[PDB]
Write a protein that binds this ligand. Structure first.
Ligand SMILES: O=C(c1ccc(C(F)(F)F)cc1)N1C[C@@H]2C[C@H](C1)c1cccc(=O)n1C2
Ligand SMILES: Nc1ccc2c(NC3CC3)nc(-c3ccccc3)nc2c1
Length: 334
């Protein structure tokens, strides 16, 4: 066991190993301090989870967050440098601290951009996504605040960003489809890319109805091929009885932009998720010509998410989270 010290920041107390120094609060899932890690010499982000075991839903959330972070080993995805608790035993285990690399800023703070910069940033998102998706994980909440970028324009997909979330959400999610796939994240990338290129939120809906309306303006109302794949009786009604809208030509919409950028946007922002380009396919698109390397775009080890369907007691989730704290193997330093 390392030696811990206490202090107070923003009402919240913090009990961290002495290894981590100069804790400075940066924003409030939980609250984050920037710190200096004496062991590795790195600036780091230390995230104290807020009430990790307040309920079954929190406790499962906490377990889920730890499992996901421990699995992620890729340059474009947030990784775990360390995880610790001040607790001596399971009996007193109440607090979870997660340690990751401190990134300079989020893509929300980055505001338009040069086309060569958007190429590099969207390349990196897709590279991280190929990896996440290969493990059968779907991010579901991609948006500029969940994309951390450092001084060097190096980008990492984040867990959580600690602006409406609806703005980047795939329409099949909006409409509550149950069998949506990994391309929901591709939709979001499409929305993010569009915003980087024009400097404006692509679909700034005031609510879920307005959101779908704005999406449909650009992509058009469902065609015959998509219509016949819709299972829900009312969903089909709501769309067979909205004023039919043509798909817009994206060239008419993103005027100025690189035609390759426009073309990729066309492949990402397909209303029908069956037709939408995957992360692996997008990486091969000509737009990423100067970055694409099929030998340096790894996939992930398999990830066991069987726990997702399990209905457990709060103290069981807490116990399993505790095992995960204990079994953690720090990554080897450079
Ligand atoms: O499933 C995730 C999630 C969690 C962690 C990670 C990461 F970066 F660690 F791999 C990715 C996605 N998210 C979907 C939503 C909102 C966010 C992001 C989130 C963060 C942490 C736990 C969680 O249940 N959720 C539910
Ligand atoms: N193979 C597919 C492909 C796309 C789909 C989609 N997406 C459309 C943008 C709404 N929506 C729905 C659906 C089903 C029931 C209720 C609400 C939505 N199903 C889809 C099945």
């Amino acid at each position: 066991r390392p030696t811990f010290y206490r202090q107070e920041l923003n009402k919240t107390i913090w009990e961290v190993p002495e290894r981590y120094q100069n804790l400075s609060p940066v924003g409030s899932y939980g609250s984050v301090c920037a710190a200096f890690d004496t062991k590795t010499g790195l600036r780091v982000a230390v995230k104290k989870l807020s009430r990790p075991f307040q309920s079954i839903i929190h406790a499962k959330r906490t377990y889920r967050e730890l499992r996901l972070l421990k699995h992620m080993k890729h340059e474009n995805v947030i990784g775990l440098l360390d995880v610790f608790t001040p607790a001596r035993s399971l009996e007193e285990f109440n607090d979870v601290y997660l340690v990751t690399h401190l990134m300079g800023a989020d893509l929300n703070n980055i505001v338009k951009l040069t086309d060569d910069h958007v190429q590099f940033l969207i390349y990196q998102i897709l590279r991280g996504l190929k990896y996440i998706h290969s493990a059968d994980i779907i991010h579901r909440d991609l948006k500029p605040s969940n994309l951390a970028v450092n001084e060097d324009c190096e980008l990492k997909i984040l867990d959580f960003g600690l602006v409406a979330t609806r703005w980047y959400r795939a329409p099949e999610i909006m409409l509550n489809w149950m069998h949506y796939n990994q391309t929901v994240d591709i939709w979001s990338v499409g929305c993010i890319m569009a915003e980087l290129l024009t400097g404006r939120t692509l679909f700034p809906g005031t609510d879920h109805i307005d959101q779908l309306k704005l999406i449909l303006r650009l992509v058009g109302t469902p065609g015959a091929e998509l219509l016949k794949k819709i299972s829900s009786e009312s969903a089909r009604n709501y769309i067979q009885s909205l004023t039919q809208m043509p798909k817009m030509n994206f060239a008419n919409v993103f005027i100025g932009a690189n035609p390759l950028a426009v073309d990729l946007l066309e492949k990402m922002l397909v209303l029908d998720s069956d037709k939408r380009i995957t992360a692996a396919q997008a990486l091969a698109h000509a737009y990423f010509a100067q970055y694409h390397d099929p030998d340096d775009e790894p996939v992930a080890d398999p990830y066991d998410q069987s726990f997702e369907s399990r209905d457990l007691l709060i103290d069981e989730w807490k116990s399993l989270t505790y095992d995960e704290v204990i079994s953690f193997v720090p990554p080897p330093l450079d």
